[PDB]
């Protein structure tokens, strides 16, 4: 009927910058593993027991607040159903205590390693303490949001994080079908531990507002008339010549002397580029069709010519120009090309990883254009600008 | 007997014998989660001996099963611990008691 | 006030409809007094309690969600659906399902008035819903120790969206008996002033603590991984309201 006051222990949570989520256009293996190493810990620093729980959490649902919250107090990963955890004896979810049988039946103690696994494709969260499997397994949870490792460390505890083999040596070998979390590091920034939804930071007093986050949707990476088809074929020949010049192999030949498989690949690429440009709703570029060869090729000089002796005959740099208003169109075309390439790779099973595991169906560049690396984005922009300049040199100019 | 869920393992080499004073640090609480009594906040360890019947019989049995340097959760049915009404103003009648007892040291 | 043939009812109506661009977004509404489930898990001694809501005309059932809500509900999304409900299932030896809320969608359930009812037995632990005297196969098993609140979230498409109806059934004790310890044996439904409706405000003021926990993180090594360490005893006083679980 009345209210009760007692001394509770302040709690806080930390999380590395890595994000793992599940969606239709998933760029991850769908099953990740991390290891947690616990150093010396005081069992009772204060009157209340130390609060130590490890598990996954949602990117938009689990927003721990220092102080008030659900339950009596000391909100952690088990205080709300937005996150799940395991304290050693009980599996907590939404501030509900449910004991889980363990081979050791021991709480979180020093000189122990905590190993947990989660599957994005099928809802299943499994954790093991010191290598001993735990019968209790979380299941039947919806895949919206992104699951990240998180520890609700207490005031007097010290813990060590082992995201992947690159970051630190694993105490136990990962289970089959589970990959270390170091392969899920975002390319934009290095993986560092940061507080979750923290509104305060240390200031040499640095107040912090809301933190921008990317949802699972962000994690996911026309007709060609014959008159335009001739220009598309000319652009295919020009692109093949430019690629041969850049690579300077039988492919290092002229535009009309390119190998048949190379010519077919160039034609397919030019057709895809023309379809993407037409889908953008740009202006009609069917002008000056006969002026395709207006530019003078520089491959005639020996220095520009390849070592094999063949002259690719590419477009002149001075003659080829790019419209300033077409930069946005070029960037959009490059982004669309990257997206369709990532979708094709995902169709074959390729996913984002820190390394290039081609036999394991892993694409290191399977990221959206917004989240793409600086080098890849610059290369895509340069390729789009070169294509636009080649089209302009052939008399095709559009406003977009 | 009362149920004992070992949160933290103990050596178990020594056990509290009859007539020997025992030192505990308990943090008992009710089923609903609202704590009612604890000896840790008071910073005064509780001292009692087996056979004096000062503590509840369930507490004495748990201490008998208890081991030095071991932390476990001890729950009591209302029959053994404060049957019917008991300790007015603290323990509601017909209410269970869950204790977190731990041996710092023996006599 | 409850009449001879009318149980004590609480009505929620839109003050402005179609004037000055009145908002029609879905609203989250929760009752004040919850029902406490019995810790033990084994006609006046019945452990079942029933409450009903009379959905007035002009409100589409597809935008009606009535049932029970866990006091850990912190969702204020306009796109409310049964599929978009946070829930987990614990499997050990044992298999139980715990969810933040337990509704049944009105659109799938059904100018007629849809009298949605909910039957909850604390001892049994199972929840049943009956509409217009017709039972439903939708059943949920909550944990033995729970503090579920009455739940009704509707989107206002009419001047009168939904109205409460706290009345005793033919043989089921009224919800007021379970809500109030003193009125446990009283079978006459009542509507005391404490039983007031509460909406989910999107943002509420909270005091920022003066002193925060000092946490320092660094890279332990190439093989030891990332390491964090905090050594600072910080304690806080907590005020918790028994009626609604909060700190």
């Amino acid at each position: 009927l009345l209210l009760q006051t007692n001394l509770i222990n302040y709690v806080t949570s930390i999380r590395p910058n890595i994000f793992v989520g599940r969606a239709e256009g998933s760029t991850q293996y769908g099953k990740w593993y991390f290891e947690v190493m616990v150093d010396e810990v005081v069992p009772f620093l204060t009157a209340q027991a130390t609060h130590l729980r490890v598990g996954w959490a949602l990117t938009e649902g689990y927003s721990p607040y220092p102080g008030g919250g659900e339950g009596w107090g000391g909100n952690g990963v088990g205080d709300d159903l937005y996150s799940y955890g395991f304290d050693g004896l009980h599996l907590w979810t939404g501030h509900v205590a449910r004991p889980v049988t363990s081979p050791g039946q021991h709480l979180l103690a020093p000189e122990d390693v905590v190993s947990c696994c989660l599957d994005l494709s099928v809802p299943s969260i499994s954790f093991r303490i010191n290598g001993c499997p735990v019968q209790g397994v979380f299941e039947a949870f919806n895949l919206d949001g992104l699951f990240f490792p998180v520890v609700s460390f207490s005031a007097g505890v010290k813990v060590r994080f082992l995201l992947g083999g690159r970051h630190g040596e694993f105490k136990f070998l990962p289970p089959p079908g589970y990959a270390p979390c170091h392969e899920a590091v975002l390319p934009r920034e290095r993986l560092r531990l940061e507080p979750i939804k923290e509104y305060r930071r240390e200031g040499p007093p640095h107040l912090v507002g809301p933190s921008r986050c990317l949802s699972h949707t962000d994690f996911v990476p026309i007709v060609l008339p014959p008159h335009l088809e001739r220009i598309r074929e000319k652009l295919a020949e020009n692109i093949h010549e430019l690629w041969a010049l850049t690579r300077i192999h039988p492919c290092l030949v002229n535009f009309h002397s390119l190998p048949e498989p190379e010519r077919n690949y160039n034609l397919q690429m030019s057709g895809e580029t023309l379809k993407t440009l037409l889908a953008l709703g740009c202006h009609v570029g069917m002008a000056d069709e006969k002026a395709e060869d207006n530019l003078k090729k520089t491959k005639l000089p020996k220095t520009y010519m390849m070592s094999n002796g063949y002259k690719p005959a590419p477009l002149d740099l001075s003659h080829v120009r790019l419209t300033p208003a077409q930069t946005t169109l070029v960037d959009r075309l490059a982004e669309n090309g990257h997206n369709v390439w990532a979708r094709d790779r995902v169709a074959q099973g390729w996913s984002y990883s820190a390394v290039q595991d081609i036999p394991a169906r892993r694409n290191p560049r399977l990221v959206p254009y917004r989240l793409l690396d600086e080098a890849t984005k610059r290369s895509n922009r340069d390729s789009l600008c070169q294509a636009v300049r080649t089209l302009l040199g052939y008399g095709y100019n559009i406003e977009p | 007997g009362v149920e004992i869920e070992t949160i933290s393992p103990g050596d178990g080499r020594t056990f509290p014998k009859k007539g020997q004073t025992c030192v505990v640090h308990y943090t008992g609480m009710l089923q609903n989660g609202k704590k009612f009594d604890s000896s840790r906040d008071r910073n005064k360890p509780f001292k009692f001996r087996i056979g004096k019947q000062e503590v509840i019989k369930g507490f004495e049995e748990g201490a008998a099963q208890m081991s030095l340097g071991q932390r476990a959760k001890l729950t009591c049915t209302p029959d053994v611990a404060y049957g019917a009404t008991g300790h007015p103003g603290v323990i509601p009648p017909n209410a269970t008691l869950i204790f977190d007892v731990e041996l710092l040291n023996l006599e | 006030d409850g009449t001879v043939d009318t149980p004590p009812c609480l009505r929620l109506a839109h003050r402005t409809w179609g004037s000055q661009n009145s908002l029609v977004e879905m609203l989250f509404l929760r009752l004040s007094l919850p029902v406490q489930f019995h810790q033990h898990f084994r006609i006046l001694n019945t452990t079942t309690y029933y409450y009903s809501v009379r959905v007035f005309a002009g409100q589409e059932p597809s935008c009606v969600w009535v049932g029970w809500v866990t006091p850990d509900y912190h969702q204020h999304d306009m796109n409310f659906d049964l599929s978009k409900v946070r829930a987990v299932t614990v499997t050990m030896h044992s298999s139980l399902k715990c969810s933040n809320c337990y509704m049944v969608w009105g659109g799938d359930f059904v100018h007629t008035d849809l009298v949605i009812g909910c039957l909850v037995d604390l001892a049994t632990g199972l929840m049943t819903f009956t509409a217009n005297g017709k039972e439903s196969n939708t059943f949920f098993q909550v944990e033995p120790n729970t503090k579920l609140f009455p739940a009704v979230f509707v989107l206002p498409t009419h001047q009168n969206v939904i109205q409460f109806e706290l009345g005793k059934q033919k043989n089921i004790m009224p919800l007021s008996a379970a809500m109030f310890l003193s009125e446990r044996k009283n079978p006459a439904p009542q509507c005391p002033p404490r039983l007031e409706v509460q909406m989910l405000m999107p943002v509420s003021w909270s005091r920022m603590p003066n002193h925060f926990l000092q946490v320092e993180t660094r890279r332990a090594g190439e093989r030891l991984g990332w390491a964090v360490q905090c050594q600072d005893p910080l304690t806080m006083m907590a005020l918790h309201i028994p009626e609604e679980n909060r700190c």
Side-chain angles (χ1 to χ4, degrees), chain A residues 9 11 20 34 50 61 108 133 151 178-179 187 261 375:
Chain A
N9 293 12
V11 292
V20 165
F34 63 72
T50 42
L108 262 287
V151 59
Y178 292 96

Side-chain angles (χ1 to χ4, degrees), chain A residues 6 44 47 89 105-106, chain B residues 6-7 9 35 40-41 71:
Chain A
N6 68 318
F44 268 87
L89 272 300
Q105 302 270 40
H106 84 93
Chain B
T6 297
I7 314 149
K35 92 182 308 183
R40 317 192 93 119
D41 43 348
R71 270 205 53 215

Side-chain angles (χ1 to χ4, degrees), chain A residues 58-59 61-62 64-69 71-78 81-90 92-99 101 103-106 108-110 114-117 122-123 125-127 131:
Chain A
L58 257 65
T59 179
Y62 172 69
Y65 272 6
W72 196 256
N75 305 262
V77 306
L81 324 160
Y82 279 120
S83 49
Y84 320 112
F86 158 74
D87 50 30
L89 272 300
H90 325 78
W92 271 24
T93 176
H95 222 76
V96 187
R98 284 173 263 256
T101 81
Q105 302 270 40
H106 84 93
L108 262 287
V114 152
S115 74
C116 164
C117 321
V122 50
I125 291 180
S126 209
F127 26 68

Side-chain angles (χ1 to χ4, degrees), chain B residues 8-10 12 14-16 19-43 45-51 54-56 58-59 62:
Chain B
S8 162
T14 191
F15 269 60
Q20 194 163 48
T21 53
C22 162
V23 182
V24 312
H25 260 297
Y26 73 111
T27 325
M29 26 198 297
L30 295 194
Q31 260 159 315
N32 298 44
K34 322 188 273 287
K35 92 182 308 183
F36 66 98
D37 162 353
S38 96
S39 83
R40 317 192 93 119
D41 43 348
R42 288 194 275 281
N43 210 77
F46 179 55
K47 326 273 211 173
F48 91 105
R49 54 106 163 181
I50 318 304
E54 39 191 323
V55 311
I56 327 163
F59 200 92

Side-chain angles (χ1 to χ4, degrees), chain C residues 172 174-178 180-182 184 186-215 217 220-221 225-228 230 233-237:
Chain C
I172 292 99
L175 200 73
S176 95
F180 286 3
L181 162 73
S182 91
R184 186 69 53 86
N186 205 322
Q190 315 176 59
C191 45
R194 197 167 139 192
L195 243 193
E196 281 316 91
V197 301
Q198 288 162 200
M199 301 146 278
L200 196 44
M201 291 325 188
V203 47
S204 211
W205 282 108
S206 153
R207 183 184 177 278
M208 157 198 327
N210 326 62
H211 291 66
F212 294 97
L213 203 47
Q214 292 320 101
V215 51
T217 177
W226 273 93
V228 82
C230 157
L234 218 62
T235 47
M236 171 205 198
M237 301 205 47

Side-chain angles (χ1 to χ4, degrees), chain A residues 8 137 142 155 159 161, chain C residues 86 91 226 228 230 236:
Chain A
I8 212 66
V137 164
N142 154 283
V159 85
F161 263 121
Chain C
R86 285 309 333 166
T91 51
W226 273 93
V228 82
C230 157
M236 171 205 198

Side-chain angles (χ1 to χ4, degrees), chain A residues 1-10 12 14 45-46 58 66-69 71-73 81-82 84 93 96 98 136-138 140-142 153 155-157 159-162 165 167-168 193 199-200, chain C residues 70 74-75 83 85-91 98-100 194 206-209 211-215 217 220-221 225-228 230 233-243 245-247:
Chain A
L1 254 289
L2 316 180
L3 323 173
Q4 314 90 345
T5 89
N6 68 318
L7 264 283
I8 212 66
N9 293 12
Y10 256 128
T12 81
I14 216 70
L45 186 50
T46 87
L58 257 65
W72 196 256
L81 324 160
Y82 279 120
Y84 320 112
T93 176
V96 187
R98 284 173 263 256
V137 164
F138 283 132
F141 51 89
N142 154 283
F153 74 118
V157 83
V159 85
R160 286 197 289 104
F161 263 121
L162 294 162
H167 293 106
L193 301 173
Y199 55 90
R200 200 269 330 160
Chain C
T70 288
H74 313 289
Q75 311 154 26
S83 69
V85 160
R86 285 309 333 166
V88 86
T89 291
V90 55
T91 51
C98 162
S99 312
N100 208 359
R194 197 167 139 192
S206 153
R207 183 184 177 278
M208 157 198 327
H211 291 66
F212 294 97
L213 203 47
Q214 292 320 101
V215 51
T217 177
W226 273 93
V228 82
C230 157
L234 218 62
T235 47
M236 171 205 198
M237 301 205 47
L239 257 184
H240 148 277
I241 316 171
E243 325 169 334
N245 209 331
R246 210 130 54 79
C247 178

